[PDB]
Design a binder for this molecule. Structure first.
Ligand SMILES: [Mg+2]
Ligand SMILES: [Mg+2]
Ligand SMILES: [Mg+2]
Ligand SMILES: [Mg+2]
Lengths: 305, 305, 305, 305
């Protein structure tokens, strides 16, 4: 009965867009937003870790979301990741995001220290209470956060009526299946590991949020079309092509998001700036990998679209 | 164009069948083998860890395989897991299995100590050399063995022409995708995590070896039929029903395989005996869980077949 | 040989001192600094994770360090932990700390994302270059940061002449031994795990930085006196009493640092405020644990001093 | 109060002694036993993983212990590690060991599968009941077994009056401290990680069982003498020399125990045979490392004895 159709489809993570001085670029943010509208994705996931949120200030993240919403509002579903190291910064971003009329806010767990489940629930509920009219997505990423969304913690969080589901970036597709089986029809699970897109989708994730989607959004849209059509052979071919490109982008000395920003300059003429330190920048030796990955994306689009 | 069709389908792990004194029961083994023939599964995976191989002697494992082959030969594909703690016992079982005409032998890595990749390759190659006319399957289970089949170790093992692929029991379906992508069309990957059957299958596992399949083989056959037909909604319904049964069986005090042997007595009149210590036996309180799981299996068969 | 005597001894982690509104309290910070001067510890480790640095702004951390330096009167070795999520905030705190004439700056690795060793070295070297006249301590805490100071990364970092050594919070005392053996006499290793103080000290840590020291600094000073005298029976008595107190403080619902601030109100009349969310606050049921731990500290001081 | 003085001191792990055909050598076992008597160690720990027990049959392990007991002449404390993959083989070895009058039997936990604590306790108690008049040592090695001796499981095991303590090979010396603090004076903790010998000893391990001791037993006896005298600087020098030798021995292609057997041929003229496959054998390139480590041991003995 709760309507979650606006979340069903391909929702790329929005990248950090910087100017030449390394500050957030309003023009760069608007340009990348126009790119996502033109590519016909379902939505954008803004100021996630793929958007370098770990490395941004509250003010940086407000400027990014304001500039996304100037272009995207009414055209894309917008999920704003608002978690910060502390609760008060997270509440400030939640209130700001509700003020702009985002569809949902999201939060990773507390990081660095491994906090008990009651403290994790308190953090998410405090963030949710700052945006009390806004859908809330839990982002499960135990490999990086150091704590997991357990089945017991998910039961506790489903007591909050704003919680709509889970963006799952743990590696077991079993976790998707268990969260969806426990929660039932009024919740959505998003597939987080792009390399497993087709496998998380078939086992019950009806949404998909990914850090590599922005490099090749047409391929993930075509993958999703094949899955919805039961064309599993064609879906596998596209998944394998996407994964080969991911492995190529991850083979660079510079960070994978540095590779993606360079690819989008080659393939689209988009200027997204550098990646923020401490993420490592590309070196000269990486430009052959960038060029190869960019061409692999063009070749896969020609093969599959 | 190596022909691996005989490995493509549902291959249950064969359970340990004991008499009342706790020794291997030839009659019990033949009974369980006739059951798998009657259920029309593709093959059986014999003396794996689901068959309590960690807890069996070389002589025990010879008696099991002899009694399986008496019923199964020419009816079922037979894969004999031959790995033991040391190399010489593994070579003895490999030679014995080739002497009986199994389709393939299989091996987990060395366990307990974490041995370097060259020592892992030497162990597998020594086992393969003792069955030099027999297909060889690597069993990847890093969570239990403590070492993984890495992409570099798989490159080295593909130099052995008898290696036909990998039974993958790591949790990431990404591992299935990467092994299949690296190896190509002349290799098969088997899905190991039963809870992820449909997800591993769609991303490129053309076989499936599972410890829970013997409790409910018709449900996994029906799941596989749905997947091959592109009927992903029906596949998901069956996967969810199978996983609910697995979670019920795992809720007991006694070991999951003790629950399955008790279910097979209720549902099929099969007498497989106890589980071998140190695996924990059922307690009286577990029989309500056994009865509930057995009824769940009957109800799923009535719903889905 | 480089003189590191000012770092040898007991250097408590400095706690976050808040007012009733949860902001940094200048008067609270000065109070806690004068407490450490009167207890005769060697120094203080300021704005570490035990000081809630994860949860503090750059401005918060500047206010803390300014108020320490205002009242320390040169009586304390001051190590200022300056690592932030991003490099530019870390460089800002490094420059600020050198401007106040701290003895050393310190840095955990980059967190959340697992960055390659060249990126970790670039982060530390960038922070060090912002305080180019200041001693630099690497803080190794792989359990929380998700990356380790490896032997190869330590070789690279010893190329920077400002690096004086490692605060080691990994659990193996082998790591202390290996870092000390590799580096030699011109470097200092600080023991991080308070529960292993005597064990890390004897195997080559000549310094000690600890989150629990501020609850009971006289006990750690007396432990260190026993170790330096070769009085290992007396040292073990104190270590066991300290560890029992730590286990009692960690038994609370509220965060261990919340327990310590409540203990310091009982035993010292110090008002340090709460802990910052998301760290969980004490509940009513915890005050029995707080009072028991406070009494255990008083009784240990009567037994051992 | 239970007298555990016979367990306090240096107890080397006894190596596997093979003939040229790779079977257990009765003459080789007697020779290595007489070597340990000559070197004046407190005892031997027989058929542990350093003795290649994972790779031995029940019959192999009986032959080893028979030949130790034949020539020890009451001069050594004998701890017989009797754990096997299954319970019945473990019970057979426990009964055999009690029949020879060993001082203690020992057991690692169940391996490969991760069994619940009640199943671990059942395994140890079944082994102990087969040697009901014999002291029992729990061997904690979570890194290899995949399960830990938790504080709760140790409480349960202290209900068995034959349990005398724990050989602790987990890396935190905190685990030694917590086991000793819980158990008190009628129990002994043995330090397992040889690289941490002096640190485990000072925090409350009164015994020490080590796989590298047999390469250089005089150095560990001299280390223990320095610790008992409170001479921590002299102790640290010996610990560092021992650790440098361990790191050299572990730098070979062949397994560390293969390097130690080759060193004992050079330094002592002992013939212990190969290591059992799958442990990797030395290659020609390793003989320079063997000779260097053998010389390092001679040089350390000249410096410290
Ligand atoms: Mg990177
Ligand atoms: Mg069990
Ligand atoms: Mg806490
Ligand atoms: Mg080795």
């Amino acid at each position: 009965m709760r309507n979650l159709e606006k979340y069903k489809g391909v929702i790329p993570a929005f990248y950090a867009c910087y100017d030449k001085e390394g500050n957030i670029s309003p023009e760069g943010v608007q340009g990348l937003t126009k790119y996502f509208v033109k590519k016909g994705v379902k939505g954008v996931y803004v100021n996630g870790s793929s958007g370098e949120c770990i490395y941004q200030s509250v003010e940086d993240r407000k400027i990014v979301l304001e500039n996304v919403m100037k272009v995207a509002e009414g055209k894309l579903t917008v999920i704003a990741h608002v978690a910060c190291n502390n609760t008060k910064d997270s509440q400030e971003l939640a209130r700001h995001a509700e003020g702009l009329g985002v569809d949902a806010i999201a939060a990773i767990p507390p990081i660095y220290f491994h906090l008990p489940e009651y403290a994790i629930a308190q953090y998410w509920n405090a963030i949710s209470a700052a945006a009390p009219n806004t859908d809330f997505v839990i982002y499960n990423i135990p490999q990086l956060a150091g704590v997991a969304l357990t089945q017991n913690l998910f039961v506790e969080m489903r007591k909050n009526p704003n919680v709509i589901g889970v963006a799952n970036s743990s590696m077991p597709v079993q976790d998707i299946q268990m969260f969806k089986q426990a929660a039932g029809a009024e919740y959505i699970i998003f597939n987080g590991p792009d390399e497993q897109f087709m496998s998380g989708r078939v086992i019950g994730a009806e949404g998909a949020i990914g850090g590599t989607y922005g490099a090749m959004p047409e391929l993930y849209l075509k993958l999703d079309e094949c899955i919805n059509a039961g064309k599993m052979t064609e879906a596998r071919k596209i998944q394998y092509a996407c994964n080969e490109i991911i492995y190529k982008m991850c083979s660079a000395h510079g960070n994978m998001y540095a590779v993606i920003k360079a690819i989008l300059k080659i393939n689209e003429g988009l200027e997204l700036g550098a990646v923020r330190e401490p993420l490592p920048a590309l070196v000269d030796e990486d430009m052959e990998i960038v060029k190869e990955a960019a061409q692999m994306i063009c070749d896969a689009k020609k093969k599959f679209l």
